[PDB]
Each structure stands twice: as structure tokens, then as C-alpha cells.
Design a protein around this nucleic acid. Structure first.
Ligand SMILES: O=P(O)(O)O[C@H]1[C@H](OP(=O)(O)O)[C@@H](OP(=O)(O)O)[C@H](OP(=O)(O)O)[C@@H](OP(=O)(O)O)[C@H]1OP(=O)(O)O
Ligand SMILES: [Cl-]
Ligand SMILES: [Zn+2]
Length: 187
DNA sequence: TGCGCTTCGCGCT
């Protein structure tokens, strides 16, 4: 239903250029009889609530806003669900977001979480520990490659028929942040 | 609000 502006996607999912926002596109699919049952309306996207010191507001990271709308997704406790995020920035630890997703994964064992990050948010000094905490809690933690960039444009963007157009250095930036993530999940 | 540059903003307007 709600689709992203092409420009917003291209300026925020670029894996070589950062933004002071985080977008998170999500898919919820249900596992049926050893197969995937793709939930058609359980697809969406959100961004973080921007910090607003002028209003006294500390901000709320994209990941925590996803945990906020879980109730509204009406996941059946009986069914088993795979949640996939495509997130412009890897989840933080320092602000408690990794703690929360972990706590939520321990609580909801019928949820399997997959995270694809465009870019690694090493502006948080404990970013390693975020990614490690999330892996430890069962979550698949990956870097977004061409296939996930393309999937997200095809599924979340108001493309009006335009094929995804890879930006310069997509594959190089993706290999580089793949190397960094592999080394941080080795330990 | 919109700008300019851009690591879940900041510092102008
Ligand atoms: O997820 P998207 O990038 O939007 O594109 C999908 C994807 O791509 P491929 O054709 O490149 O594999 C599908 O494969 P998966 O999502 O299962 O990985 C494919 O289904 P098939 O692999 O069976 O071809 C589907 O086509 P459709 O949705 O009609 O089944 C196709 O769309 P495009 O290939 O046209 O981008
Ligand atoms: Cl986060
Ligand atoms: Zn966070």
C-alpha cells in the first residue's frame, strides 16, 4: 500500500554515502509445511523518529519503531514467522536497540529475524557488540548486496515501472562491508 | 519551513 519515493530510497540506501536518517523496509512471512507463505499486506517501511532537542525529544531508532508496530502486525502466536529488515544503517548497541531486539527475540520464539544492513553504523563505538548480540540471539545479520537493493526497490519503491538502477560502487561497497561484518561475526 | 552537507543531525533560517 504505502510505497517509498524513488529519491528517498536512492539517497538513503546508497552504501557509499551516509544520511542522518534511518529507513527500515520490513517483510513478514509465515512458514507453512516446510515452505514460505508470503504475507502480502505484511510489508511496509518506516524511518526513525528524528531527535528534536527543541521539543526535548531524544529520537527513536528505526529498529525500535519496528518493535513498536509489532502489535499492529497481529502475528499469530500459533504460527511461525520470518521477519526481514532492510535497514539503511546497522542497528546500534549504545542506545539500547540491540538489547531490545534480543529481548524481543527471546520473548517471541515463533519469530525468526533476518537483518540486511546497507551500511554499518560504526558511529556507535559498540557497533561490533550490537551485531554480535543480534547474531547471538538467533538473528541472521547480513550486508545488503545488489539482490537486496533490487528486491527493496522492486517491492518498497514507487518506481512506476523503472527497473532499479545500481549506483556507482554498489558491489565494491557491499564486498567491503561484507568483509567487515564477517570479521566482526567471526569473533 | 527550507538549506547545505550528510554516521538514527545540526545549525543556520
Ligand atoms: O525480488 P525481486 O528482485 O523484485 O525480483 C524477483 C525475484 O528475482 P529473480 O527472477 O531475479 O530471481 C524472484 O526470485 P526470488 O524472489 O524467489 O529470489 C523472481 O522469481 P523466480 O526466481 O522464480 O523467477 C521474481 O519473479 P516473479 O515475482 O514473477 O515470480 C523476480 O521478479 P524479476 O525477476 O522480474 O525482477
Ligand atoms: Cl538502532
Ligand atoms: Zn539504535
Amino acid at each position: 500500500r504505502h510505497l517509498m519515493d524513488p529519491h528517498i530510497f536512492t539517497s538513503n540506501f546508497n552504501n557509499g554515502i551516509g544520511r542522518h536518517k534511518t529507513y527500515l523496509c520490513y517483510e513478514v512471512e509465515r512458514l507453512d509445511n516446510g515452505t514460505s507463505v508470503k504475507m502480502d499486506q505484511h510489508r511496509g517501511f518506516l524511518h526513525n523518529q528524528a531527535k528534536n532537542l527543541l521539543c526535548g525529544f531524544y529520537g527513536r531508532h528505526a529498529a525500535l519503531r519496528f518493535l513498536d508496530l509489532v502489535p499492529s502486525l497481529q502475528l499469530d502466536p500459533a504460527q511461525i514467522y520470518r521477519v526481514t529488515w532492510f535497514i539503511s544503517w546497522s542497528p546500534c548497541f549504545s542506545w539500547g536497540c540491540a538489547g531490545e531486539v534480543r529481548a524481543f527475540l527471546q520473548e517471541n520464539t515463533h519469530v525468526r529475524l533476518r537483518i540486511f544492513a546497507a551500511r554499518i553504523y560504526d558511529y556507535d563505538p559498540l557497533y561490533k557488540e550490537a551485531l554480535q548480540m543480534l547474531r547471538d540471539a538467533g538473528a541472521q545479520v547480513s550486508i545488503m548486496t545488489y539482490d537486496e537493493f533490487k528486491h527493496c526497490w522492486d517491492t518498497f519503491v514507487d518506481h512506476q515501472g523503472c527497473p532499479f538502477q545500481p549506483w556507482d560502487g554498489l558491489d565494491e561497497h557491499s564486498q567491503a562491508l561484507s568483509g567487515r561484518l564477517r570479521a566482526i561475526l567471526q569473533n
